[PDB]
């Protein structure tokens, strides 16, 4: 459980974390992009919508980040075939960036989100420093497009995992 060694944002505040986040980069060993997150607090848990533009069409996936009893630590419960996904919001100033850790089947990934572009060089370097500390190489870092985002899908392109 590599993600259990990660400290969540102290006194994580869902209210300040709410809103829109843009995916900047992902560090993962896991073997059409431009992603956007819409976060809305639901008491203790967080309702999370993910939007991705594929071949011009915007798709939306509605999920629920369940409260795990530790502020800043969430759980995307397993969905039969889909293994459970542990989520941790580590570093974040709520106003410009967020570094999140995800774990599935014991495999840790690190994601960098921003409120708007461009992201500061300091945050980018910080993220890179966190990626190597998670035992991931520079070649396991994937930077997403700064163009191609979308944040609205019609009823025919919405997947509800809630």
Curated annotation (Swiss-Prot):
Keywords: Complement alternate pathway, Complement pathway, Cytolysis, Disulfide bond, Immunity, Innate immunity, Membrane, Membrane attack complex, Pyrrolidone carboxylic acid, Retinol-binding, Secreted, Signal, Target cell membrane, Target membrane. It is found in: Secreted; Target cell membrane. Disulfide bonds join 58-150. GO terms for biological process: complement activation, alternative pathway; complement activation, classical pathway; killing of cells of another organism; positive regulation of immune response. GO terms for molecular function: retinol binding. Membrane attack complex (MAC) assembly is inhibited by CD59, thereby protecting self-cells from damage during complement activation. MAC assembly is also inhibited by clusterin (CLU) chaperones that inhibit polymerization of C9. One of its GO terms (cellular component) is blood microparticle. Coiled coil: none annotated. Component of the membrane attack complex (MAC), a multiprotein complex activated by the complement cascade, which inserts into a target cell membrane and forms a pore, leading to target cell membrane rupture and cell lysis. The MAC is initiated by proteolytic cleavage of C5 into complement C5b in response to the classical, alternative, lectin and GZMK complement pathways. The complement pathways consist in a cascade of proteins that leads to phagocytosis and breakdown of pathogens and signaling that strengthens the adaptive immune system. Belongs to the calycin superfamily. Lipocalin family. This is Complement component C8 gamma chain. It comes from Homo sapiens (Human). The chain holds residues 31 to 200 of 202 of the full protein.
């Amino acid at each position: 459980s590599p993600i259990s060694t990660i400290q969540p944002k102290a006194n994580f505040d869902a209210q300040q974390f709410a809103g829109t986040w843009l995916l900047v980069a992902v560090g993962s060993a896991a073997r059409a992009e431009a992603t956007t997150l819409h976060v809305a607090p639901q008491g203790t848990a967080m309702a999370v919508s993910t939007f991705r533009k594929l071949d011009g069409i915007c798709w939306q996936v509605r999920q629920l980040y369940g409260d795990t009893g530790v502020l800043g630590r969430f759980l995307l419960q397993a969905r039969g075939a889909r293994g459970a996904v542990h989520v941790v919001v580590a570093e974040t100033d709520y106003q410009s960036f967020a570094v999140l850790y995800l774990e599935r089947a014991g495999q840790l990934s690190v994601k960098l989100y921003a409120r708007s572009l461009p992201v500061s060089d300091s945050v980018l370097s910080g993220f890179e420093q966190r990626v190597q500390e998670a035992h991931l190489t520079e070649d396991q870092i994937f930077y997403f497009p700064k163009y191609g985002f979308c944040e609205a899908a019609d009823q025919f392109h919405v997947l509800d995992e809630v």
